[PDB]
């Protein structure tokens with residue numbers, strides 16, 4: 001399918017390169033040029049009309065690294081906002097508008113710790129699992145029992161309605177990851193760990209085969225986007241799976257903001273209640 005909306009760097013709403021633009025650059029001499037050079041070429045070839053048989057439209061301004069287009073990812077975004085001359089309604093984007101993006105830098109233990117602590121210490125300089133702080137995720141969504149649309153605290157799979165107490169399956173809608181804590185994690189009960197025929201010594205493949213949490217596979221990594229963050233699975237401890245926001249955004253006050261379709265006003269309005 002044609003990806004119409006892009007950032008000013010010609011990357012899509014998920015933060016990744018479009019196959020059509022990648023091929024367009026490759027057909028010219030330019031797949032290994034810098035992003036700046038590639039964008040100069042695209043601007044010289046009618047910008048959003050460069051593909052000829054379909055149109056693009058710039059919805060976002062992003063600051064990115066200068067890596068070649070084919071190597072651009074959401075982890076190469078430094079900041080994101082609405083494009084100054086885009087006057088339409090912003091579609092869903094991987095990061096909230098008017099935000100700065102932080103990427104977790106991998107750590108190397110001088111002395112590899114075994115088990116879960118070695119896995120988490122490749123992410124955070126923590127001495128114990130309890131130094132990790134669980135995030136508070138929420139989604140603005142309808143409750144099937146009381147029909148109200150409200151902010152339901154959730155994990156990746158289940159949300160709870162604050163009006164009536166009903167658990168609801170998480171569906172697409174405005175999402176936030178709350179404030180970004182130090183040593184940020186999202187903890188969920190691990191089905192593989194709970195199954196006696198599999199159990200806590202399971203593999204990473206075992207985790208994803210039984211979690212029921214869909215991921216995107218790309219260049220050997222698996223991620224799930226939610227609420228302005230890009231999450232990856234780290235490992236399990238005491239039968240809970242730990243995910244970390246390998247990328248997170250900050251709209252102000254350390255808050256991850258709101259992502260989703262038609263959330264521009266919501267995300268702006270949220271900033272106002274973070275301070276006085």
Ligand SMILES: [Zn+2]
Pocket residue numbers: 018020021051054056
């Ligand atoms: Zn195209």
Ligand SMILES: [Zn+2]
Pocket residue numbers: 143144145146147148161162163164165166
């Ligand atoms: Zn309800």
Ligand SMILES: [Zn+2]
Pocket residue numbers: 190191192193199200202207235236239240241
């Ligand atoms: Zn597990």
